[PDB]
Amino acid sequence: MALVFVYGTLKRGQPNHRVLRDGAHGSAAFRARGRTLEPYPLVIAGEHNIPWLLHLPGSGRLVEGEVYAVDERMLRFLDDFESCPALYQRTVLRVQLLEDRAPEEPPAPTAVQCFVYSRATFPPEWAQLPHHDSYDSEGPHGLRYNPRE
Ligand SMILES: O=C1CC[C@@H](C(=O)O)N1
Numbered sequence: 001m002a003l004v005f006v007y008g009t010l011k012r013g014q015p016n017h018r019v020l021r022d023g024a025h026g027s028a029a030f031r032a033r034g035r036t037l038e039p040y041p042l043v044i045a046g047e048h049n050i051p052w053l054l055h056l057p058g059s060g061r062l063v064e065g066e067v068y069a070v071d072e073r074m075l076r077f078l079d080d081f082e083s084c085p086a087l088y089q090r091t092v093l094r095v096q097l098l099e100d101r102a103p104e105e106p107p108a109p110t111a112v113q114c115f116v117y118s119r120a121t122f123p124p125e126w127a128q129l130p131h132h133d134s135y136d137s138e139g140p141h142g143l144r145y146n147p148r149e
Contacts, residue, residue, distance in 0.1 A: 007065035026073025034095035
């Protein structure tokens with residue numbers, strides 16, 4: 001099993017969230033709301049308006065997302081769902097846990113290591129596209145995700 005930080009179309013309310021809940025693919029259980037500890041550029045790019053976490057830590061913005069506990073069946077599914085390693089790569093990062101209420105002695109941990117689907121090789125100009133802190137297909141940019149061909 002592993003923890004995966006999702007920031008794009010897999011989040012609750014987003015167009016591919018269903019694939020986490022299709023038990024043919026294994027299990028995924030929501031653990032927490034999170035925010036990356038380091039900033040990355042998160043951009044909407046290409047004809048399908050897909051979101052890409054560019055692997056440029058230390059630039060961009062802190063990225064909001066959701067932490068899921070997944071089994072190995074679900075992780076293998078997701079790796080193929082994301083066309084890894086050719087398109088995205090599964091890398092690791094640390095995420096700040098966001099609680100419903102601000103914070104006891106000893107205090108609760110506030111970070112966790114997760115896998116994430118990031119992209120290392122891209123048209124360089126993508127790095128100058130608008131940077132997002134929270135992706136929404138139906139967000140104010142108007143660039144709706146569309147898997148059509
Ligand atoms: O659309 C996307 C980007 C990577 C994955 C996610 O939600 O994290 N799906």
